[PDB]
Write a protein that holds these residues in place. Structure first.
Motif, PDB file in Angstrom:
ATOM      1  N   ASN A   1      50.768  -2.180   4.879  1.00  0.00           N
ATOM      2  CA  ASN A   1      50.815  -3.492   4.247  1.00  0.00           C
ATOM      3  C   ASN A   1      51.932  -3.577   3.216  1.00  0.00           C
ATOM      4  N   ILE A   2      52.978  -2.771   3.417  1.00  0.00           N
ATOM      5  CA  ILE A   2      54.187  -2.894   2.606  1.00  0.00           C
ATOM      6  C   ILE A   2      54.890  -4.220   2.888  1.00  0.00           C
ATOM      7  N   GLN A   3      54.679  -4.793   4.076  1.00  0.00           N
ATOM      8  CA  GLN A   3      55.174  -6.125   4.388  1.00  0.00           C
ATOM      9  C   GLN A   3      54.434  -7.218   3.637  1.00  0.00           C
ATOM     10  N   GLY A   4      53.303  -6.897   3.002  1.00  0.00           N
ATOM     11  CA  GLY A   4      52.616  -7.850   2.150  1.00  0.00           C
ATOM     12  C   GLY A   4      53.413  -8.291   0.940  1.00  0.00           C
ATOM     13  N   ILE A   5      54.378  -7.487   0.499  1.00  0.00           N
ATOM     14  CA  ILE A   5      55.285  -7.919  -0.558  1.00  0.00           C
ATOM     15  C   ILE A   5      56.285  -8.838   0.127  1.00  0.00           C
ATOM     16  N   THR A   6      55.975 -10.128   0.143  1.00  0.00           N
ATOM     17  CA  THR A   6      56.681 -11.073   0.988  1.00  0.00           C
ATOM     18  C   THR A   6      58.049 -11.427   0.408  1.00  0.00           C
TER      19      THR A   6
END
Length: 78
Positions: A1-6
């Motif tokens: 969920n590193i892609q959660g830092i949009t």
DNA sequence: CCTTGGCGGTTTTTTCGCGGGGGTCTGCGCGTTCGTGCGTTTTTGCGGTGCTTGTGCAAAAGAGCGGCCTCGGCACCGGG
């Protein structure tokens, strides 16, 4: 969920620093450096908690770890 | 107080940065559609009380009996 830092969020974070233009390749770099910093602080807080014979990480461990890294935080019971 | 290697001024040389000019592409800006966060109410887990199930600690007399002992009676050793 590193892609959660949009992308808009990291754009806002760069914008607070006074940056006018953003390269397209910078976002992965910021995600990487944020991951590295979070990794270090989380590691130190976790071993602090493990020494304290506890199963729940409290805010004091986090503030302790940050202050031990020269990043003293005010406002959370320090 | 002695000593000498090196800073320093001067004169040639040489070369890298900035500006101009040009070109390109890529984030910025905006519009549209989609997602998945915060906010509520509902559900599952930890705990306590009350109720139910297990269980330790007075002679008198006769009849019958086991041990026992004297005795009966016999077979046997030794000798010819």
């Amino acid at each position: 969920n590193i892609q959660g830092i949009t992308k808009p969020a990291i754009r806002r974070l760069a914008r607070r620093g006074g940056v006018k233009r953003i390269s397209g390749l910078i976002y992965e770099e910021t995600r990487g450096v944020l991951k590295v910093f979070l990794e270090n602080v989380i590691r130190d807080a976790v071993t602090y908690t493990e020494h304290a014979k506890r199963k729940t990480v409290t805010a004091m461990d986090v503030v302790y770890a940050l202050k031990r890294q020269g990043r003293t935080l005010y406002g959370f019971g320090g």
